[PDB]
Amino acid sequence: PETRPNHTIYINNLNEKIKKDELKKSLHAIFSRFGQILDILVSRSLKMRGQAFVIFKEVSSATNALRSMQGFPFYDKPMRIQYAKTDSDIIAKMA
RNA sequence: GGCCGGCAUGGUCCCAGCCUCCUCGCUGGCGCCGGCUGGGCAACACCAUUGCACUCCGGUGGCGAAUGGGAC
Ligand SMILES: [Mg+2]
Ligand SMILES: [Mg+2]
Ligand SMILES: [Mg+2]
Ligand SMILES: [Mg+2]
Ligand SMILES: [Mg+2]
Ligand SMILES: [Mg+2]
Ligand SMILES: [Mg+2]
Ligand SMILES: [Mg+2]
Ligand SMILES: [Mg+2]
Ligand SMILES: [Mg+2]
Ligand SMILES: [Mg+2]
Ligand SMILES: [Mg+2]
Ligand SMILES: [Mg+2]
Ligand SMILES: [Mg+2]
Ligand SMILES: [Mg+2]
């Protein structure tokens, strides 16, 4: 359902027909305005398809991105967003 | 994509057309029928999947495809 605040947002219900490189770029296009993005992780494997991790440098960015883009129609599908359950390695490798 | 068999089929060159998972080719292929067989999921389609990762990594399918004109 939902979890504790995090630098990283977990996005799913994404259109699975879209390729990894395009998907990453399109996600930057709509999410960059919430704050600096450290990385976007995408895989098309059987387990990880339809999903993305957007890693913000500051948690407040993640928070605003989550509230604002919940259900945003993206490649004809309503985007579902939550905080990631765990910190991404890029975040742990800092603080 | 490869090989073989049967039948049909005069040769060389030119132009145009058509076909596609298999160099979309600046020279790849394209008579009819039938059997054997290779590679790969890179793209595409379909099936399955709503999945919390930081390790690339589900499956199946097609190629069971494609002809006119001219010069000598
Ligand atoms: Mg990209
Ligand atoms: Mg990458
Ligand atoms: Mg997967
Ligand atoms: Mg033969
Ligand atoms: Mg005869
Ligand atoms: Mg015959
Ligand atoms: Mg002869
Ligand atoms: Mg003649
Ligand atoms: Mg020609
Ligand atoms: Mg034409
Ligand atoms: Mg064609
Ligand atoms: Mg047979
Ligand atoms: Mg986790
Ligand atoms: Mg085959
Ligand atoms: Mg002729």
Residue numbers in the entry: 4 to 98
List passages from the publication reporting this PDB structure:
In addition, residue C75 (C76 in the antigenomic ribozyme) is essential for the cleavage reaction, and mutating C75 to any other base, especially uracil or guanine, inhibits the reaction. In this study, we have used these new techniques to correct and improve the cleaved and the cis-acting C75U-inhibited structures of the HDV ribozyme, which were originally solved over a decade ago.
By using a combination of PHENIX refinement, ERRASER corrections and hand rebuilding in Coot and in KiNG, we made multiple changes to the model that improved its agreement with the experimental data and its MolProbity statistics. The pucker corrections were particularly impressive; hand refits and the use of RNABC were initially successful in correcting only one of these ribose puckers, PDB residue 152, refitting the C3′-endo pucker as C2′-endo, while the other seven ribose puckers were each corrected to C2′-endo pucker only by using ERRASER. A close look at the electron density near U23 led us to model a second alternate conformation for this residue (see Results) similar to that seen in the inhibited structures. This suggests that release of the metal ion from the active site indeed makes U23 more flexible, but the residue can still sample a conformation similar to structures when cleavage is inhibited. The final R = 19.85% and Rfree = 24.08%, improved by 4.75 and 3.82%, respectively.
